Structure formats: C-alpha cells, structure tokens
Amino acid sequence: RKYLANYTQDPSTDNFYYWTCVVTVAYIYNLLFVIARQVFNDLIGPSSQSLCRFYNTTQVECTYNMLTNMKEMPTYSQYPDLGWSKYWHFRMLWVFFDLLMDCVYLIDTFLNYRMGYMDQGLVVREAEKVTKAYWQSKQYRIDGISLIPLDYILGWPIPYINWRGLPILRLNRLIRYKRVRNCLERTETRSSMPNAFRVVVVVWYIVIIIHWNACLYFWISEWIGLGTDAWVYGHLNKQSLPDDITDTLLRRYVYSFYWSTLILTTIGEVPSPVRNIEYAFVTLDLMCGVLIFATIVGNVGSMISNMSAARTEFQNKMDGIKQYMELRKVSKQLEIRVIKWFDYLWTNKQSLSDQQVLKVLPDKLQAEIAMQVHFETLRKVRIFQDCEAGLLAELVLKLQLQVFSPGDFICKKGDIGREMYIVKRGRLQVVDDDGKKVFVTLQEGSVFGELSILNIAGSKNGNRRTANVRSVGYTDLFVLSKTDLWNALREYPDARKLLLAKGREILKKD
Amino acid sequence: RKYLANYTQDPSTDNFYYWTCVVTVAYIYNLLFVIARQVFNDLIGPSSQSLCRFYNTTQVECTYNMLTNMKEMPTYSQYPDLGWSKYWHFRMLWVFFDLLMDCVYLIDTFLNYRMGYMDQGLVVREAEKVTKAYWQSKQYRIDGISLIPLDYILGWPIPYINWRGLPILRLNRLIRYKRVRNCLERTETRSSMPNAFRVVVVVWYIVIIIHWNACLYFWISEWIGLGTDAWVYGHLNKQSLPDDITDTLLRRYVYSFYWSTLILTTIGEVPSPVRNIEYAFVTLDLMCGVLIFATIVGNVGSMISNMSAARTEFQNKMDGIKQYMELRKVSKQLEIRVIKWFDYLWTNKQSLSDQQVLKVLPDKLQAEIAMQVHFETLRKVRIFQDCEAGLLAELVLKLQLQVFSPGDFICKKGDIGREMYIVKRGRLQVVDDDGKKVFVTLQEGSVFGELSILNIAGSKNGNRRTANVRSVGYTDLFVLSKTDLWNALREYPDARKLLLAKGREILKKD
Amino acid sequence: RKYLANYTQDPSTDNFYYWTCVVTVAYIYNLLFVIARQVFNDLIGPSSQSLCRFYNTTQVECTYNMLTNMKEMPTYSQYPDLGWSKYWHFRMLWVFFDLLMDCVYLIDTFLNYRMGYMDQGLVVREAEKVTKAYWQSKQYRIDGISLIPLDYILGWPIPYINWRGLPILRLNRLIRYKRVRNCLERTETRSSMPNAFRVVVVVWYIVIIIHWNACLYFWISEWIGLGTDAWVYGHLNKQSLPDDITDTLLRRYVYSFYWSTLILTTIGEVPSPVRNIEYAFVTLDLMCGVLIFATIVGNVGSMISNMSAARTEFQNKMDGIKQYMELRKVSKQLEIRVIKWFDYLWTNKQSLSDQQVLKVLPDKLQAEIAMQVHFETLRKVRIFQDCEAGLLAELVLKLQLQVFSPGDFICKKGDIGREMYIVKRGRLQVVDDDGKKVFVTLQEGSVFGELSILNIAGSKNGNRRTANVRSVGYTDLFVLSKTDLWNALREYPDARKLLLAKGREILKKD
Amino acid sequence: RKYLANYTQDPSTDNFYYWTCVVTVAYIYNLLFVIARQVFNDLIGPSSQSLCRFYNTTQVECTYNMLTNMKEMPTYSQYPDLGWSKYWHFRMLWVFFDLLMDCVYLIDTFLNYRMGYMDQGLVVREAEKVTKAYWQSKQYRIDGISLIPLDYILGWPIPYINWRGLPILRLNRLIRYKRVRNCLERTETRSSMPNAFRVVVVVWYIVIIIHWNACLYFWISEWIGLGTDAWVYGHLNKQSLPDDITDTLLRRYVYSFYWSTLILTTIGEVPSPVRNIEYAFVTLDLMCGVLIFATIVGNVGSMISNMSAARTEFQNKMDGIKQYMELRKVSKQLEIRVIKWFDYLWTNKQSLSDQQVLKVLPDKLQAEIAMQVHFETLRKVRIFQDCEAGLLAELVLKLQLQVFSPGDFICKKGDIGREMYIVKRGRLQVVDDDGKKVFVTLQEGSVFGELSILNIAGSKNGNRRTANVRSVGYTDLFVLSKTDLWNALREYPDARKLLLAKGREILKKD
Numbered sequence A, B, C, D: 001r002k003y004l005a006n007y008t009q010d011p012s013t014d015n016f017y018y019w020t021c022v023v024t025v026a027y028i029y030n031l032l033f034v035i036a037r038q039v040f041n042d043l044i045g046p047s048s049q050s051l052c053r054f055y056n057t058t059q060v061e062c063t064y065n066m067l068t069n070m071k072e073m074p075t076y077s078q079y080p081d082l083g084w085s086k087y088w089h090f091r092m093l094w095v096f097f098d099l100l101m102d103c104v105y106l107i108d109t110f111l112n113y114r115m116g117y118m119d120q121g122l123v124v125r126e127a128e129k130v131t132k133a134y135w136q137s138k139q140y141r142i143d144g145i146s147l148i149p150l151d152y153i154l155g156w157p158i159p160y161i162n163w164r165g166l167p168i169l170r171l172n173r174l175i176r177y178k179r180v181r182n183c184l185e186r187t188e189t190r191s192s193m194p195n196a197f198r199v200v201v202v203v204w205y206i207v208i209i210i211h212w213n214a215c216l217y218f219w220i221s222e223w224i225g226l227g228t229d230a231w232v233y234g235h236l237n238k239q240s241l242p243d244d245i246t247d248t249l250l251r252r253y254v255y256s257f258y259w260s261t262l263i264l265t266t267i268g269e270v271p272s273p274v275r276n277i278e279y280a281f282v283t284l285d286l287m288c289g290v291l292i293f294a295t296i297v298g299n300v301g302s303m304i305s306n307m308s309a310a311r312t313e314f315q316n317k318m319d320g321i322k323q324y325m326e327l328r329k330v331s332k333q334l335e336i337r338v339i340k341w342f343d344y345l346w347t348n349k350q351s352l353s354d355q356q357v358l359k360v361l362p363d364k365l366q367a368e369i370a371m372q373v374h375f376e377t378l379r380k381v382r383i384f385q386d387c388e389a390g391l392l393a394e395l396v397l398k399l400q401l402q403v404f405s406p407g408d409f410i411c412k413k414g415d416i417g418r419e420m421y422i423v424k425r426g427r428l429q430v431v432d433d434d435g436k437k438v439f440v441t442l443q444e445g446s447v448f449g450e451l452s453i454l455n456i457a458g459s460k461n462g463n464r465r466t467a468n469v470r471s472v473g474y475t476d477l478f479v480l481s482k483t484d485l486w487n488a489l490r491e492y493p494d495a496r497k498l499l500l501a502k503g504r505e506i507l508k509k510d
C-alpha cells in the first residue's frame, strides 16, 4: 500500500480521461439535484405533514383525494421529530449518493496532489517535485480546499431539533468546474462525429438552465405565500391546479418546468404578475431570456449550419457557374458537359481540395497522411519505386488531383508541355488521327506527359507533346508542374538518370 | 423477354433521373399518407359507426346536424363486419395505390440488382459482374429486402375479425430515402434557377414536419380520452369545436394542422395543458420547435440571402468608395465621374470578374467557355487569325476586361507601355493636340498598344506610347500584360514574325 | 411642335432620373390605393346607404350614434342611382388623379418609343433607328401595351346601372415595375448616405406588405358574412368593435392594419379562427409571415449590421492584439504604447487602408483620386516638382502611409535602408547621441531616407542609415519600398540625375 | 487664480478620460431622470392632492387603503400653492443635483474653451491660439451654447402661480452626446476584458430604451383619460390594478416598465387597444420593436459570438481534418497521433499564429513585442549574443514556431536542408542507428540544422542532414527558412564569420 503513497498520475492517458468523465458525472449530479433538494423539500422527506381541512371542520391528515380541487391551500404542520422515523430508505439513499460523489471529489483531489505537470514537453513523474508544484500553485490548494468542507453534513435536514436543513450549502462543490471543461474540450476532439456530441451538450445546457430557472420560479413562489395570488404556483392560478388534478411533488416540478420553458423562450402564455416584486422578477427573467436564449439558439442554428458547410460552399460555386453561362448565352452542349463534370466531381467526394490538411497541419503530417492514402496507388509507379531515395517524400507534398471529362484530350500534338501526369484512376488511350493509330492504354499508376518536361530533343520537337492522349471515361490524374519536378530533381540526379534513360528509349521510336 | 433478364442499367442516363423522380413520388406518398391513415382511421373507412345520443334518450346513428353543438362526445360502436360492405370504392382505391407504389419499389429493386457500378471512370454493364457487386455489398440486400416484406397486407384493416389494422407497418418503406436524396441532389444541379427549387423543397419540409406533428397531436389526443379535457381535441376545448361547427374528419385534420403550426412556430395561442403527461408533451414539442424551426427558417432566410449576394457585394464595395471620397473631400467632378463608372459597370452586368470560372473549374473548361463567349469578337482580330497555331488557346486564359470612361485617355504620349489592348466594344479614336490630328477610329476587334510592348525602336523612342489613344464613349478593352504576351510568345516565333512585321510598318510612318 | 415628333431621349441624363422618379410615384399610387379601393368600397362612395334598425322597429338611415354598440350588423341597401348625385367632389378627385397617373404612364410610353439605346458605348439618338429598336424588341410593345388598356374606365363604379365597379382591373398597371427598379437601383448609387435610403425603402416594403395583407383580411372578411362570427371584422369579435367605439371606414382600415401587423410578425394576439376556411387562411398567412418577415427583418438587421462594419473589423483586430499581450505577459509600458498607437490611429480616421480604392476601381481612377487627395501635400516636394515627367503618376499608385508613435526612432544609425519616407504630417528631428547634435527638423512635404536606397558610397558606408531620425509627436509618413523606387527609376533617368545630384551634396558633409 | 485663466487642457491625459467619464455620468443623469420627471409629476411633488371619494359621499383626501380596489379613478385637486410648503427636502435635493450636473456641463465648456487641438502630431497648448481654434470652429460655440440656457429654472414647477412646470426643457442638454461617445470609444480600448464592458453597455441601451418607451406608454396614457378604458393604465384594465394592489408611483413605473418590456420584445401579453389613436400607437410601437430589438439582440448574439471565435475557428479546422481521415480510411495509429498533436497544440495556447500582430501592427511594434516575449529564450543563444550587430532585430520578424510530436524525427540522415531550427522548449537528442549512438541532447535556446543551410562541404556531403535529430517529447522550434537567413546574412558578414567558424569545427569531427 506504500506504493500508492508515492504514486504519480500522468495527465496524458486514456484512463485519466475516463476519470475526468467520472468527476463530470459527480458535477452534473450536484448542479442538478442540489438546488432542487433545496427548493422542493418535499423531495428528501417531507419534513412535515399536510393538515388539510374538510368540514363534516377538523384539521385532518393528507388524503390523495382531498389534495385535489381544494378550496384553500393545505397548512404545513411539522412533525415532533421531522424525518427519518417515517422515511428511512430514501434519506439513506441520498446520503449514500452524496457520500459517493464526495468520494469522487476526494480521489480527484488526491490525483490533483500527484498531477504530473509537464516541464518542456515531457511528463514529470516524481516524489517531492510534483507536490512542490502543487503548493507553489496557490490556486490548487485554494479552490481545491474550498469545495470539500463537507459542511453539508452539518447543514443537512439532520438534526431533528431546530434545523430545517440547508442543502444549498453543497453549492460550494460547483467550483470544480474547470475539470469538467477539460473533459468536454477533450471529448469533442475524440468523437468521430463531433457535431453530434456538440449538439447534445447544448441541449443539456438548455435543460439545466430551464431547470434552475424553474426552481427559481418555485422558490420565489414559496417565499411569497403559496396559494395567495394568481401568479404563484397553487390553487389561485387555475393554470397549475385545474380542478380535477391532484397536488403533488411531480405536479410542482412539472408546472414549474413548463413555466420556465415559456418564460425563457418568450412564448409567454402564462398568468400575469400581481405584485410589484413579481414584475421585478418576470421582467428580469424575460429579459434574461431574450438575451440568454437568443444567443443559445442562435448557436444551435450555427452548429447545424456549419454542419454540411462543404455542401453549401459547393452549391455556391456551382450556382455562380451556371449563372455565368446563362447570362453569356454559351452553347447547350458545353453547359451540359460542365454540369456533368460537377456532378461526377461531387458523387465521388474526392473533391476535397485537401487544403485543410495543407494549411492547418505541420508539414511532416501532410507527408505521412498522403503517404498512407495514395500508398497503394503510387506503389505501382516505375519512377518512385526505382529511385532508392525517398524523393517521393518530396513530391507528395505537391501533387494536385485534376479530374478530366470522358473522351476529352488531356493532350494534343504540337502543344507546350508544362505538366506531367500520373494516373490515379480511369484508363486512357494514346491515339492519333481520331482512331486507327496504336491505341495504347495506360491504367492507374501509369506515368506520362514526362517527355516534354525533360528538355530532350533527339527528333528536335522541343517542349512539344509528341502524341495526343485521350481519356475513355472520367479519369483522375496527379498533376506535377514542371517547376516542381525540376526544382526537386536537382537534389536527386539518379532520378534524372533513370527518367532520361526511359526518355531516350521512348524518343528512339521517333 | 429473355433480354430483360440480362438487362443492365446505366446510372448516368437522363431516363434514370426520371425514374428516381418516380421513386421519389412513391416515397412522399408513404411518408405523407401512411402515418395519417394510422392516426385518422376515419379515413379508410370508418371501421365503426357514431352512436350519438339525443333525448326525446336512445342511442341513434350519426346525423350531420347532431354532430354539431354536442353535449358529450359520440360513443364509437363497432360494426359486425367493420368495413368493406358499406365502403368499397375507397378501400379499393387505397389498395390500388399502395400496390402501385409497391410496384415502383419492386421495379426499383430489380434496377438495383442490375445497377451498372462504375469501375475506373467507365460504366460496367455486365451479366454476372453486376450481380456480384450487388451481393458483395451486403447493405444492398439488407436495406433493400427490409422495406418490401409487404407486411402491410397482413396489417391492413382486413381481416374483418379481430384486427383493427396497423397501417403504420408501412413505415418500413421509409428506409429507401437514400434514393430520394440522390434525386434532389441531382435536381438542384440541373435546374436553371436552383434557388427556386431549393426554396420550394424547404417549404415541403416544413409542411411534412408540421403534418406529422399534427398527427402526433391528434394521436396523443386519441390516446388520452377524446373530449375529456380542455387540451385534447374535442368539445371540451371550445377552440376546435365552436358551437355551430359540425364535427368531421376535415375539421380534425384542419385543427390539428393549425395547432401544430402554432406550437412549431411558437406563437402558442393554444389552450393550455391539463395533465402531467401533456406538459411532458407540449414542452417536448415547444423545445423541439424552438430548435427545429429556428434552424429551418434561419435557412430560408440564408437562402433568400445568398440569392443576390452579387448585388450585396457590389453595394458594399461602392459604399466603401463613396465613404472614402466624402471623408477625404475629393472634388465633385471626380466623384460624379466615378459613380457614373460604377453605374455603367453594373447596368451592363459584364462586371462579373469571372473568377468563379477561373478558380472553381478545370483549366481546360475555362478555355472552351471563354472560347465560345468571346468567339465572334476575337474572330475579327488580325493577330489571332493570322497565326496557324492555336496560340489563342494560351492567351484566352489570361485576358482581363477593363472598362474605361468616355473621353478619357487610355494612353498618353510619352508613357511606359506595359499592356496591350484589344477592343471588345465601343469605338475609340487616335488623336494628338486635342483634335485637328488624324482621328483614327478603331472599332471592336481591333488591336493596339502593341508597339511599346514589342521592344523595337526604329525612331529610338523606346517603351513609349507613340500616340495617345482616346475613348469616345464607354469602351471595354481586353488587357494583356507584357509579361504574359512575351512568356507566351517564345513558344510561337511565327506570331513574333507577323506582329513585328506589322510593327516595322507602323513605325515606318515615323 | 413637329420637333417633338422626332425627339429622342437620352437614358443617361439627370432629368431622366427625375422622370423615372415620377413614374415611381405613379406606381406606388396604384399599388397602394387601387387594391384598397377594391376592398373598402366605402372609400369612393359609398355606393349604398346603411339601413340600421332601432326599435321604437323600422329600418332607418345611418346615425353616427347608432353605428356604435350595435346588436346586429347594418343591412346595406342600395341607392336608386348609386353614387355621384350624393358624392361629387370625391369621385371627381379620384378620376383626376387616376387620369393624371395614366398620363404619366402614357408620356413614359412615348419616351420608351424614343429611348436612345446604347450601341458600343455611345448613345444612339436617331429618327427611325430608335423606333426600329423598339419594335424589334417584342417585349417593349408587349408589356408596354398591356398596362394601358384604360379598361378601368369601363370597370369603374360608373355606370349607375348593373355595375358595382371592379377597380381591381387597374392592377394591370403594376407590370411596369421594371422602371421603378431602375429608379431605386440608381438612387442608392446617388445618395450621399446610402444605408439611410436603403433602410427607408425597406420600411416602405414592410408597410405596403402589411397593407395588402390587411386588405386581404378585410376582403376575406367581407366574403364571409361580416358580423357572423368571432374572427371576421365586426360586432362579433369584441376586439374590433368594443362597445363605445363607433363603426367607420377609419376603424376598418385601422383594425385590419393592426391585425395584419400581428399575424405578419407572429405576436398573434388575435381572436382565433372559427371556420375551416379561416384556418386555411390564418395558417397560410402565419406561415407566409414566419418566412416573409423572417427574411425581411433579418435584412434590416444585416443592413444596420454592415453599417459601421469598419468599426467592428477594428475592434476585432484590436481585441486580438490585447488578448495576445495579456497571455504572453508583455510589459505594461509596451502595451500602453501600443494601445495609444491604435487610439490615435482611429481618432484621425486616416486609418483607411484604401484597399477599397485599390482593388475595386480601375487603375486610372486610383491615380486621379490619390492625385487630388495628396495634391497639396506632394505639391511641396522637391523630387516630384523638379522632374518634368509625370513620374509621380507612377509612384502615387504605390505609396503606403505608415503612422509612427512620438519620440520613437524611425531610423537608427548603422541599419539597412530599404524604404524611403515622405512626411505627410507631424515634424521630426535629425539627432545623434540622444541630443546635443544638430536637431534638424523636417516638416510635412519633406523627403528623407533616400541616401541608403540610392547605392552610393562616397564615405563607403553602404546601404546604411547615415543618421538616426526621430519623431517628436505622432507622424505620418509615405513609404516607398526600394524595389518600387528603382523599378520606376529606370524609366526616368533625369530623376536619377537630380536625386543623385542631391545625394552627393548630402554625403559631401561626411 | 490668474493661472487658471490662461490654463490649457491636454486631450491626451488619463485625467481627462476620468473627466469625460464624469460628463458621462451627468449625461445619463439627464436622459434617465428628466423625461421621467416630465411624465411622472408625482415624482417631484406631487403638485396636487388625491380627492378620492367614499360614500358614508363627500370628497376626502388620500388614504393608503382607499387607493386600493377603487370603483373610479381619483380626481386630482390642486393645492393653493402647489409644492414646496408640503414637500421641501425632495425638491431641494433635485435642485442640488440638477445644479451639480449643470456645473459639470459648465466646467466641461470651460475645458472646451481651452482644448489643446492637435497640429501635426503635437499638442498645441497656447493662450490665444486655442481660443482662436474654438471660435473658428463655429460648431463649438453653436452646440456648446445651445445646451446651457439654464431655461429649465424658468420651466421648473416653480413658480407657485400659473405654471405646472416643463421639466422636459432640460432635453436640450442631450445634445452634448458627442463627449459621451468619445468616452465609450476610449473605454473599450482601455478595458482588459473588452467584450465584458461591451456587453454591459448594450444592456444599458436596452434598459434606457425600454425606460423611455415605458414613459411614453404612461404619458400617452395620461393624455387619454387615465382610467377611461382597458388599455390605459388604471383601474379599467385589471392587469395593472388587480383588486388588492394599492395605487402608487412605484406601481405606475413598474407596470409601465413591464408593458414596455413586452411590446418591445413582442411577447405582447398585454390588454388590447381600444381607440384608433391607441392602435396607431401600439402598431407604431410594435413595428418599432420588431426592428429596434431585432437588431439589438442580433448584436448581443453577435457579441457573445465573436467572443471565443478563436475556439470556433479551431474546431472548424479540426473537424475538417478528422472528416478527411475518416473518408479516406487512413490508419488508426496515424489518426490518433494527429489528434494528439492538436490536443497539445491547444492545451498550451501557444497556437496563436500571431498573424494578428503581424498584419495589423506597424512593423516596428512587431519587433519590440516579439523582443520582449522571446527575450529570455533568445538571451541564451550563441549566434544572437555573439554578433555585436542587432541583426536579431531583423530575424525576429521572420521566425515561425513549429510544434513537433514526441519520438518523431525532426531530421533524417541524407535529406535536403532548407530550414534551421532554434529550440524554444522541450529537449531533443541527436541519435544514429535507433540508439547506441552518442545521444546528444539540446535543451531550449540551442541551435541546430545550421550545417546544411551554410553551403560548406568539407566531407563533400552537401545540403544534406549530417545526423538525424529526434525529439523526446512535445518540442517547439523556431523555424528560419534558408532564403531568410541568407538574405539577412549578406548585411552582416561578421555573423557569417562566426557561424562558419563553428561550422568548420562541427564538420571537423567528420
């Protein structure tokens, strides 16, 4: 057991993220149930009995039929010992759970004690060094000590004598929120489908908000006499107690939740304020809503917005194009051909310009990603395989995928060669004179367009396309600009030797 | 008929898009009418009779005057055989239509069997290969089999004995939605006016949404006793049955549709909830609305937004300009002149920078588009026509249209020549000394500004404008930077020969 | 008068814009008053008398006290001749005005006949050519003929016998809207304060929209029996006729306008629908509103948004900066100094990067604008004034204004000279050794930093700052990069001669 | 005291900003309390007594129990001398405060007299020059004189005879608003947390707006007979005076504030208009709200939006990345590694590209900022410390921080050297053959990658990495591209001498 005294925690383990998730469950526990325990003291308990009165006029106890359709509100008369004698299982449950959550807080604090802080990229896991880092950071001990007084035990509804119980004291536990943030932040970055999680979270915000606010309605409604006017919960406003509904805990939470729902989303179909104090409230609360919920739902909207912003960008680009063609009265054949290009461009979803990977990432990560992705396709290329050098490691960074429509000339005889293409998919044939030539077909992995780039003129043609290469269907090519090939080629003269060695043999035929 | 056994379907035909459109009509059929058939069982049928009671106190049948202004809700008493004996035409109709839709589903599945998948840009239309692709893709047979059990026939209101009918089983047909998406996606990209279609679609979403939700109101309202409180449809809430209105199917759908309209757009002018279960509902539904419709209508807004975003961008640029001139106290003549420039720039709508075509498209498509568009205008140019080479094919990519105000010097004597202009429209005159010179007028298609770019100095003037060219009205010029002309000119020395051959003859006069 | 037969109109005159503005007033006339004349036939007229009945039970005429607090709606009993005998001034007014508006339409059509269309930048003002252009464009005669049948005269409430009058026929005049657009488009581009006008316009849209819709409420309310239920205007719904209010035209338009206001902005505090037909309406209308007004007010918001987007961009940039400095724990002195830089940068509003003028405008317009603006400041510069060449015309395009904080070294001894500064405002002193040197002060218009750029080394110092120049307050400098000065300097060797001629004389001292 | 006659004020002192803040408090004073004093004349006073009547039917005075549950509104009967005899403390208070605020206005005007205007970057503090600048600017004396007539004293409720008092005259003070703007503008630019202040301000706007509007409701409600219908405040609409609430000033302001809250945020749960005039009002006011508040709350939303737009941008970039990796089916190991890179990138918040500082700021400020920040880190570098020249001053502008994942090769043997790295944090070891070499570890401040950049080949290796450098954890490097190092190195040949002097000694080992 002595090993668990000098034990140090690494912040960067998956297990720890599981733990932070646990702290999170404890947190939500408190901020959901504590306040509600404070307001609806009917919950743990009750700590008193109903004393409803029926003529035929003695005060009686509570009968589930006499808590319906009441003339006046039921007087709350307190027990001799309020509590545990009548209700035992319940209170014991709540103590087990609170005790549990608090255990989570404690264990979390022990881990905070041994948190392997990070000195220059490495995790420092040490005996006295870590604890040193703890107490040198005064904030750790300050907030950390603040939420574990366990003052709630003394504020709980126990004792039986002279104390109602202030469960609201548990609110001090709410100051550990930083841990919870560090959880959610790290959960988005894990989730396969982020915007899913990211929307679920926000729905929870709304529900807790609405919750607390409901509790506020009910508390304020307790503070003012409950059943003394048409705005405070109770028989006086017929909205909450229609005649045939029976009074309960469930009802109160239900109606209060409904009330808060409306006021916070400004439908406002709620019985109107009757005391200056209430106007104070309802206005505060209505304004609070027109700002709070404005922003909130203007974020849910933005979230479901940026979700499929790819598609939005796309339809933008395209509509631009089509507009341009309608106004300038281009042919029908050409316009059709274009829109077919876009269609196939988007039904393959290879349309991703990858400028994401380019810009945001470190250069090295671009190399390994593109490596894996195009790995098999390049694996069947003469040029990259032949050179011992990982020159490929250079060129991968700068290859751009271009899609060509079917039956269309990639190349024409007697044209300037600037690019050199490597086929990712589709098959294309070398032809001259609109057929009857040697239809030579290159499949994926093949290399062409290289004769012009390499400045060799055995037949004296020059930077001219020797043949004209045609596509048979929708073909995707890697495009490597002359400048890049050459700027990279000085570094590896062997590749020069091999590529030129092939080039002499291709120009030999001519 | 054996030819229709080995028949294979091409995904890329116009006819197929017509077909997918048909599948679409079947889909909408189901998701509109199925659920409603489930809820309003009054529709197919009814399967029972009304049994309203009037004193003077025997239970009677239904009279269209006694279904108005009722004291209590009508008891539904079931037929001996519920159904087809009394109503025949109707049920037969619904069976013909369901059977029809199902035929569409079946034919669609046979086409799915023979779907010519695309291997490397070409469509593979083959006997066993295609079917191989079907069953290798386990998802095809999984979802495809799932929606055609035809289980509805066994769940339909038939039999007469012991079965009410669960039309809701037909819901399994809803899982073919992917086909419908592939339709809409392909319809936007076809439509001449996209944003039209794109708005119509969204209006349909809203209506189906509102629809289902209405059905939900009515179902939930059936499940709770119908006419037992002030929130469930029926005589109890005077909103739906005002005294003089008669009860009907039409009414129910109408009121329920209205109700859903309000709750989903949070006007919420609707009789308030009376049972805890209903609060549960209405809150669920209100929140559901404040998110669902928030986003939806925040998209209709965005759609009508980006529609004419051209114009918005424009007014932005301009307001910037005008602001700049007011603050810096520029003259009145100059400011007027500018705003006239913008006016004519926007009344011709040739203001499109075409950077759409530039950026989004493949380079080759830019060439053919601009080819067709400027085709006639360039068709009357000496330089492009004279050279046998399709050098034009190079330059078309890099020509920028510049608009010049009337009476203003394009060129002045003794200035650096950097550009070379080709006139798209307007006419402009060569003049020296503010008139009395040889007013030489070039119309569209003409070429000038070329003497300075070509580094020839027979009179030793240099990269200097020989004359000063003036515009007579609003003239549009093609602008070709020196660097481009030259970088392109090395490739075709013949064009050099001809252009210089003209240049010597123009400088000969001087 | 024969001169007014062959008279041709120029589209590009200020007078014409005044005219289009007039056509606009006629347009608004029609789309505001026509529909209302159609609905509230009380307006022109009435064409009948009230026939209210009071017991003590004969039908009587209308008394302004008996049209209040009514038991039942007043029966409309028609005149023997309905109209002009009782009311004369009014109807004559409406005919004078309609006739007037129609005159505007006619004159507009004669101008359309003679509209000088624009052939290649110049306005073609000709006898038969213009008319040729009219009838060759079939649309001109089609829409143009369509709105002037004058069919209204035959549909007016006259005749006395057998005709009620269909003023709604005048709706055909609404098809000239294109002219009105061409007005507003041209008014924004004129207005000194655009966003003012641009907001006023939109407020008019809202009001006309709300208007028509009100008329719709009232029409539909006429079509259904007026005063037969709690949703149609009239004594039945106590919202419109509270007991003490008297019935009038004014009331109807007022209440209907209010009603439409609510339904179109979904407050919806309006008596609820009572007939299936009405639900049809109100839903149609509510949805119509949640889309129409969503967009509309989401545009008013966007308008008041982009208005002062300068300021928004600014606060963005700055908050970024301050954030950066807080996190990285920079000093206090430095941070203060920065924020003072921004303050003075924004209190002078010379902060405009002018990239508006740069990007959007033609290159020539940038030259003349900047010419005028900096005209006086440059007018007092040795270098620009001395050279006969308008070389300035080159450099003006590429000068960037840089603001420097007070007391801070623009230059330090022994540093690389890359830029050359010209002072726009402030005064700065040449000093060495933190004072006690020759404090030489350059005011605006002065030129310095030029010794290093010009590659002259008589003392062999090189591209080194000879002295160190210090600012006394907030000084604004023109900045001209070495590359620009030089690239421009090859073109004018005289400027070289003069600048170097000064340079030898400044380096002479050393 | 004569020194305070020729005393001139500097606009650019902290004290002055304190003063403007004071003027601000006076301003808010007026625009909050003046209008309310005008409307609720109950406030200062009252100037009359209540005269409520109770049968058992003589008119009596006011009793706080008889101002509850009234049958009819209380008649206001005026005093013989209305005012100061009965209420003294109050009125004296208001006069002291108004007089105070006015003193602020006066002192502000004296400061305006002596405002040191800024001529060419320097503050001109002079005797007659400043006053000259005052009166030459006619606007100063125009608006400045306009708000200090002190006309309020003559409009105050005094005199006792024949005057009710028009406090509203004080409105003329509202025209000094420019000063207040110049305060707020300068407060944002000071505040550490801007968006805090920026939101608080907007909440004040809303409250003042709502305020005035409330006053408007109440004024209009006074103008119409108060307690004559169900829309004007008073016993007639049971919303404001429910039976048990007593009538007061407090109530009026409360209810009116509530009313305005609803109408301006279109909840609109308010008793409906009863006179044509009121419809006029409420519609005006409702429309006014649907525009005013639309924009306002669409700004609070935008404010809380751009607040943490860093984080939004980040999640955008990342989600892009993860999407890309899911679709293209990259490995699990690589994907994990990436997301860990992002995690550590964002948990250090050193992720700021600093392009803010780059773009927005002057070049010199970038130098000093980065100087301070990286000061200690660079303070321990051989290269920068050794060279006497402040060459560092050059390179600081162009160093980019790159983060590398742990255990990953920064360098590999036999690769092109393009960059040269300086370690900001982390430690990394030089190793060959996957261990067993000389593990040489560089800590922060160290310099490497320099051998390849400097074109020296004593062993003939060339621009090749001699060793392969590996990281042990998450290491941050300064990256200096070859082009930059060299372009900067020509300027200081000494640095060349030293760096090469080290290079020979490192290549000596090999």
Ligand code: NA
Residues within 6 Å of the ligand: A266, A267, A268, B266, B267, B268, C266, C267, C268, D266, D267, D268
């Ligand atoms: Na509402």
Ligand code: NA
Residues within 6 Å of the ligand: A267, A268, A269, B267, B268, B269, C267, C268, C269, D267, D268, D269
């Ligand atoms: Na409402």
Ligand code: NA
Residues within 6 Å of the ligand: A266, A267, B266, B267, C266, C267, D266, D267
């Ligand atoms: Na609302």
